[PDB]
Design a protein around this ligand. Structure first.
Ligand SMILES: O=C(O)c1csc(CCc2cccc(Cl)c2)n1
Length: 133
């Protein structure tokens, strides 16, 4: 029952500062523009100890499966090859990505009927709000 409130299909409804976040991560112009235009559906499911997060959009379809606290190698939608660890901290899913001596954290939180995604690198944050599909 660890992630019960996150499970489901969620659709993007708002975004703030995502272009700047992507600039900080190092994403190039054309990818930023097409990725920024995406309106992803995020699909979260749990089977035993294995969590799966899919993100589907006209930009890219991604899928990760993982066990909490257990690192995995990930190819991000922007084509970074990162070492990722996802943990639950106080009811927040905390997704840390390490690559080329850099780090970024993606937090996923349930707030009211929304699923809020907060993306941080260095002092640049982006907040993206999803609603049930
Ligand atoms: O709203 C989302 O699901 C969301 C926000 S950041 C993220 C990781 C994947 C990602 C996609 C495009 C550019 C970069 Cl730099 C990172 N996913």
């Amino acid at each position: 029952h660890m992630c019960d409130a996150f499970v489901g299909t969620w659709k993007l409804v708002s975004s703030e500062n995502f272009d700047d976040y992507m600039k900080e991560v190092g994403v190039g112009f054309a990818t930023r523009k097409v990725a920024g235009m995406a309106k992803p559906n995020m699909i979260i499911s749990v089977n035993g100890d294995v969590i799966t997060i899919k993100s589907e959009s006209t930009f890219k379809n991604t899928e990760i499966s993982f066990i909490l606290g257990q690192e995995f190698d990930e190819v991000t939608a922007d084509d970074r090859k990162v070492k990722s660890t996802i943990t639950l901290d106080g009811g927040v899913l905390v997704h840390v990505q390490k690559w080329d001596g850099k780090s970024t954290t993606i937090k996923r939180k349930r707030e009211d009927d929304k699923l809020v995604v907060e993306c941080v690198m260095k002092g640049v944050t982006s907040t993206r709000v999803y609603e049930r599909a």
